[PDB]
């Protein structure tokens, strides 16, 4: 099975005009990066709504992952679920991104662009969807097998899922943020995988990437302590091969240099008064 190349982009999908757009839509940058890391009770409840909807869109699009389907079709399906539930797709017009979700096959680390690419037997596809509703964002992603996936690739996918859920389960107030990436990287290294460093999780709230960074590798120099009401993503990308990558000409698509496959899962988490709540739970 060949290295991927860019397919054909379908036209911008419409969203009904009553759905409120994030302020960044139709601008080259977003106003984000300095928002509070701890959210209000109002915003947390609104984030449960957004997370639930993002979780729905993801599962719907996931269900359509099958050999013969296009990445564009996955986007159509996610786009339609969001719109039907009153949500704007946060990726659409975010720093000029042209679609409603990210579709990342095989050697694509992240930020793949839904297009005419046809999914083949044995492929793995990450779908990353974000919902904007009630002035807040909800962000979740999962890698889905298509047809008869090779053992090597099923194990990667399952272990990436596990690393994510383990990291989630360390989330509690008063614990160091750096714990997340120590857990993830020690789990990945146990099976000889390498954790992507240059792409991270992020705080999320009224803004999509609010300035908080969540590293998926061991980096104990981070002093940040988790606090009740904090909201952020854990979204590790785990590589079978080396870390080196290229970015396609489209300015988004990140591909491993050795072309070995890579996988990712993501949830949006709340730090509660005593632990964690998964806001993007199905
Ligand atoms: Cl579109
Ligand atoms: Co995401
Ligand atoms: Co994210
Ligand atoms: Na991938």
From TrEMBL:
Q: Is Hydrolase given among the entry's keywords? A: yes
The prosthetic group or cofactor this protein requires is: Mn(2+); Fe(2+); Co(2+); Zn(2+)
Taxonomic lineage is: Bacteria, Bacillati, Actinomycetota, Actinomycetes, Mycobacteriales
Q: Which HAMAP family match?
A: MetAP_1
**Any one Pfam family match given in the protein's UniProt record, by short name:** Peptidase_M24
What PANTHER family does the database record attribute to this sequence?
A: METHIONINE AMINOPEPTIDASE (PTHR43330), METHIONINE AMINOPEPTIDASE 2 (PTHR43330:SF16)
Name under which the protein is recorded: Methionine aminopeptidase
What is an annotated GO biological process for this record, any one?
A: proteolysis
Entry keywords, A to Z = Aminopeptidase, Hydrolase, Metal-binding, Protease
Which gene is the coding source of this polypeptide chain? mapB
Under the heading InterPro entries, the entry gives:
Creatinase/aminopeptidase-like, Pept_M24, Pept_M24_MAP, Pept_M24A_MAP1
Q: Which organism is it from?
A: Mycobacterium tuberculosis (strain ATCC 25177 / H37Ra)
Q: Which molecular function GO terms apply here?
A: initiator methionyl aminopeptidase activity; iron ion binding; metalloaminopeptidase activity
């Amino acid at each position: 099975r060949t290295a991927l190349s860019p397919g054909v982009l379908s036209p911008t999908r419409p969203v009904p005009n009553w759905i409120a757009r994030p302020e960044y839509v139709g601008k080259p940058a977003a106003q984000e990066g300095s928002e509070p890391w701890v959210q209000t009770p109002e915003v947390i409840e609104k984030m449960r709504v957004a997370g639930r909807i993002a979780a729905g869109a993801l599962a719907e699009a996931g269900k359509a992952v099958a050999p013969g389907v296009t990445t564009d079709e996955l986007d159509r399906i996610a786009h339609e679920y969001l719109v039907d539930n009153g949500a704007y797709p946060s990726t659409l017009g975010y720093k000029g991104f042209p679609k409603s979700c990210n579709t990342s096959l095989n050697e694509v680390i992240c930020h793949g662009i839904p297009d005419s690419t046809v999914i083949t037997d044995g492929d793995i596809v990450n779908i990353d969807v974000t919902a904007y509703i009630g002035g807040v964002h909800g962000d979740t992603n999962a890698t889905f097998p298509a047809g008869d996936v090779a053992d090597e690739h099923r194990l990667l996918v399952d272990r990436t899922r596990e690393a994510t859920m383990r990291a989630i389960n360390t989330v509690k107030p008063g614990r160091a943020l750096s714990v997340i990436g120590r857990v993830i990287e020690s789990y990945a290294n146990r099976f000889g995988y390498n954790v992507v460093r240059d792409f991270t999780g992020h705080g999320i709230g009224t803004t999509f990437h609010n300035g908080l960074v969540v590293l998926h590798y061991d980096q104990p120099a981070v002093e940040t302590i988790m606090q009740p009401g904090m909201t952020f993503t854990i979204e590790p990308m785990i590589n079978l091969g080396a870390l080196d990558y290229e970015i396609w000409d489209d300015g988004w698509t990140v591909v491993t240099k050795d072309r070995k496959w890579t996988a990712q899962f993501e949830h949006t988490l709340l730090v509660t008064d005593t632990g964690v709540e998964i806001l993007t739970a199905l």
